[PDB]
Nucleic acid binder design. Sequence first.
RNA 1: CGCGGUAAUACGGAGGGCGCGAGCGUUACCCGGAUUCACUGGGCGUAAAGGGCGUGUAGGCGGCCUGGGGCGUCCCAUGUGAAAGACCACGGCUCAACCGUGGGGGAGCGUGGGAUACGCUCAGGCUAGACGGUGGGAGAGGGUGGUGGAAUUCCCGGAGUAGCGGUGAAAUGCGCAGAUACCGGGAGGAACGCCGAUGGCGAAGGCAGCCACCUGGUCCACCCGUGACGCUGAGGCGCGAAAGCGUGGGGAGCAAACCGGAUUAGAUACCCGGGUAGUCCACGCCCUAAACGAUGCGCGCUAGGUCUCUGGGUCUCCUGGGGGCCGAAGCUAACGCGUUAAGCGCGCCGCCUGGGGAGUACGGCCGCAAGGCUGAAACUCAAAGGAAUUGACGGGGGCCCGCACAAGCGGUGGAGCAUGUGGUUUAAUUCGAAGCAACGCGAAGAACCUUACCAGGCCUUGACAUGCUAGGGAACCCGGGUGAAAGCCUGGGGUGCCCCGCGAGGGGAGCCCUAGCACAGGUGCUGCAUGGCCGUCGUCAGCUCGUGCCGUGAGGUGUUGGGUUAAGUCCCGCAACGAGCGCAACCCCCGCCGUUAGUUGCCAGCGGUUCGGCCGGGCACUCUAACGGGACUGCCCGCGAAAGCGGGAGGAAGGAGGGGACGACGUCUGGUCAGCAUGGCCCUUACGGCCUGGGCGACACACGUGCUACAAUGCCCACUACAAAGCGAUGCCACCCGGCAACGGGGAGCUAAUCGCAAAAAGGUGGGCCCAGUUCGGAUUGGGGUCUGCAACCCGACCCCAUGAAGCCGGAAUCGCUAGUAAUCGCGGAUCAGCCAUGCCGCG
RNA 2: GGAGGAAGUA
RNA 3: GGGUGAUUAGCUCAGCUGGGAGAGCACCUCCCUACAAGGAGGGGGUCGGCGGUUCGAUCCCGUCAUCACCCACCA
Length: 206
Amino acid sequence: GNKIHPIGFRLGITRDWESRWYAGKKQYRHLLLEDQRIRGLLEKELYSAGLARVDIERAADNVAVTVHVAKPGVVIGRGGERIRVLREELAKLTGKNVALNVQEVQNPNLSAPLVAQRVAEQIERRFAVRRAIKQAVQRVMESGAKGAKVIVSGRIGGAEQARTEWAAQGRVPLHTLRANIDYGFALARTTYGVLGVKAYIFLGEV
RNA sequence: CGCGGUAAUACGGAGGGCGCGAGCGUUACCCGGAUUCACUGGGCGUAAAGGGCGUGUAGGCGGCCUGGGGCGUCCCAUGUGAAAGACCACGGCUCAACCGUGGGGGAGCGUGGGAUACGCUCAGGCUAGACGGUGGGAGAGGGUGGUGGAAUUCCCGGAGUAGCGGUGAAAUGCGCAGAUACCGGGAGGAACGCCGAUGGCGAAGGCAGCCACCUGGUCCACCCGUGACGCUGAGGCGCGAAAGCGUGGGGAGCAAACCGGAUUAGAUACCCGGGUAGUCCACGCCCUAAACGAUGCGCGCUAGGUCUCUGGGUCUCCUGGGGGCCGAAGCUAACGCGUUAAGCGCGCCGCCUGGGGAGUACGGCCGCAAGGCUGAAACUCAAAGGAAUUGACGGGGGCCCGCACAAGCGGUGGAGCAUGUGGUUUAAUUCGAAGCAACGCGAAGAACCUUACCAGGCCUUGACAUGCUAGGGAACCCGGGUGAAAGCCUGGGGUGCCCCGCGAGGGGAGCCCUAGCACAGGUGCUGCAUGGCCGUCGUCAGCUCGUGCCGUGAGGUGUUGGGUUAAGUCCCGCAACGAGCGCAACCCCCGCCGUUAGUUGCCAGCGGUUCGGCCGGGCACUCUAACGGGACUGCCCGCGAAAGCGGGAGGAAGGAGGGGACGACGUCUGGUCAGCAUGGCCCUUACGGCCUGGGCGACACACGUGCUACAAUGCCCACUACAAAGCGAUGCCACCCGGCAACGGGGAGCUAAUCGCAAAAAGGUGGGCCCAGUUCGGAUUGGGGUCUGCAACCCGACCCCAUGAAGCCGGAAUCGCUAGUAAUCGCGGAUCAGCCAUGCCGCG
RNA sequence: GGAGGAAGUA
RNA sequence: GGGUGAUUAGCUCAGCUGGGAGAGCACCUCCCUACAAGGAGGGGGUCGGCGGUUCGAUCCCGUCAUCACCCACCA
Ligand SMILES: [Mg+2]
Ligand SMILES: [Mg+2]
Ligand SMILES: [Mg+2]
Ligand SMILES: [Mg+2]
Ligand SMILES: [Mg+2]
Ligand SMILES: [Mg+2]
Ligand SMILES: [Mg+2]
Ligand SMILES: [Mg+2]
Ligand SMILES: [Mg+2]
Ligand SMILES: [Mg+2]
Ligand SMILES: [Mg+2]
Ligand SMILES: [Mg+2]
Ligand SMILES: [Mg+2]
Ligand SMILES: [Mg+2]
Ligand SMILES: [Mg+2]
Ligand SMILES: [Mg+2]
């Protein structure tokens, strides 16, 4: 077991942070405090739409929160009795300049978590792992991709053992910088217990 | 075959689906499938199978030509082959089954007639097969008798002393009673060094000194003879390694069994000290085998190349007989065989039919016994077996490398102290961590809480979250008594927001307290049930794919071979050619420079200077942080083809310039339920929760990692310069005074290239100490202080008067380190009310 | 390259 | 009684014809390895007690004590 966080190795170059603001000396935590629950609030409320990203725009007092979901037709509400009441009911913990965005998605099956999200959702239902990833790592490559890799591990079949799995076609040069590869963090509470659904999706270079 | 070890298309039921249907299934039997008794239609190198070999009777089989008889054989006719059976047609039952009428095939035998290619037999001829005659050839083929030398062992004489012998090591053992080693003499046995080999000989078993007598087998040439006399061979008969046996001997060495020594957990063994049978000879037995080339004999045909043994022929030439070695086609499951077949055929012999039982039991023939030959079955298993592929593993080798061995330094192990660890104990000394991967590790926070441990006190819908019922109330501030604290009881206030009503007065959302709940909660258990994260191999250099090729196929090649490098890095070659993950490189810090920009810096040029970069002033320089050029074996002198190497110039640096981060497929069923999430078991009047105190610092011990040293390159005192990085407003602390000192009061500047922490030590000068247990070291301990927080005994510093211990260079061992590295000297950070910070991470 | 003729322990 | 001889660690035992008691096994620990071979430190002794010579005794000398062997003298 090795290979540290690819994004954690990216980070300070290529893909920039999942947030964006300077912070002063003793106000860092003070902002990070409620910054995290913002994310933690939605990673099980906004889920049934496929969440993969959440920026945070700040500088002073005013905060601009941008979400990156693929299925917005349900988070927006029948006319606003969601997206505009989610804002108002978001200040209740942090009286800040309530701002929001919703960035569209043209090709869902190209974001690493969305797969791992789809897989776990598909793993929870009694489905065929090896043959729910083979379909997956193919429809990834099908959507104009040029490489992929989706590793899962746990109690496959509920048997007492715990072998991981494989489902990959092509190149995933994790060790290179310009590669630009997104990484998926999933989780699956199940009958037997807890899984570990990962995913790599190579994309391009330069 | 197997399924069921929680989520069953196999079990029991249903719904449904499949197949048959007045039937459907089970069981039993016959044939098949079973090319698995092989006539069609098999095998015997390694799978079950070649007799241990030879000789040979009956039998089977047989070269060329000519003639006869026609026994087998073939052809035609005739008889038989009954009917019913099978076959074809036509008809009778209302079809069909059933039946009827009729017509052929005909295996087989008898008779007649005919044919003679083949097999048989008779007569005759021929020369390849076979044998013989002449001349020769080689040989560990064999039996008998003798004879030679070296070496072990023993006996005798002389000389000489303190050990010999044996093993990984020692011991049993021998030895002052004269050994081991020596010289002289003598005895007695077995077996033959070099030649000697991979060679020769025989049927096999087997055969190795020399000479001789007898003796077998084979081979070459001579154109002589016999003229198919040939081959195989059931039964029989003979030979038959070693061991064992009987009777007589011989016995130097070795040595089963027996005894002792030692290793061991024990050693009925391997190693050693003795040692009987035996191995040796004559005779007579068992007759067994990895008797193996695991390959029966005989003959013919199917390419070669190549060393050699042995004949012959006017000869690096031809030819005959053998033993080895690669390989044509062919064969095999492959390995492999290959003119000496496992190839293509013929003849004959023995043998085989899953493994275990079993080479057994019975019967029989042998043998003195040990045993041998012949040679089954009941029962049981769903495999046993052979070859080859991948991988793992190895107390198999080979190569490459790494502070792994060596050259050098410094240090642990030697003393005292900090930390952690094992044990020991206390009531608790929480848990985890276990060679390399634990032990200055989770801890980068063990005075209380942290805290998970002990003891006591107390709380139980709570310290928390969601939801419901009921009383009081909103909320929220303040206090007291007691009680160690927590907790318990009580008091003063105060009284909001929405549906009405001004009003006396109904209601509701939130929040709080008291009661019933649903509940949550647990550092409880399983890292062997997990997710995630981490270490090791290991920065090792490997992990694989597409096409092609080799193989029946698994698979191999590619990745292997030589060389080179840090490297699967690269080159040559290669039935391979390319690629993906990995090395590298794209990222960061340093070495160089350009520009941009000037609140640090600058008289480098000037103008005031309390002669300070303090100022005016300026941005080359200092420094700072953004993008960029630059180093690619680029060029040249040579070397090895090749990559590469000795260079050299220019360049700052040259062959990776020097560090960081990055760690593939995979093992370690590795570490972590105690960072967190989570299955399952458990705890829920407590295994949950709060407080005071105590404990992980306890100590006869031992280890791990560090700290000062045990001193003259040394140690004190005074004076005199240089940092790089990092950090800080409710904090950093200048500076002033006070303090003989840690520090106290006042307070400048700084939310930060400015202010500060902050004085850096080794360094330089100058004086002392002149080898001492020292003016080296500070452990322990008495007394005395300031310094933070509710509170400093176990369980803080710094400082003063001291007390001043071992320590004189450290055994077996053992540790890191190949360059600004090692050592030495010092400067920061990170958690924080205080608190585990000499450990860690950074800097010079 | 093939062929012939130096380990302590579950 | 007469004379030969011992006896030392816990043990089987050396010391040389006088000059600081020692090699093995066992015991404690440390090492390389996990065991066990194997090394380095330390402890361990009334040289059987008692004496005499000697500057100085494990050894020179004389009685005891516990043995062992041999030859009797016991009315
Ligand atoms: Mg980057
Ligand atoms: Mg069961
Ligand atoms: Mg046949
Ligand atoms: Mg075999
Ligand atoms: Mg027979
Ligand atoms: Mg007839
Ligand atoms: Mg001797
Ligand atoms: Mg005997
Ligand atoms: Mg006999
Ligand atoms: Mg021919
Ligand atoms: Mg059978
Ligand atoms: Mg008899
Ligand atoms: Mg330079
Ligand atoms: Mg594990
Ligand atoms: Mg000091
Ligand atoms: Mg002072």
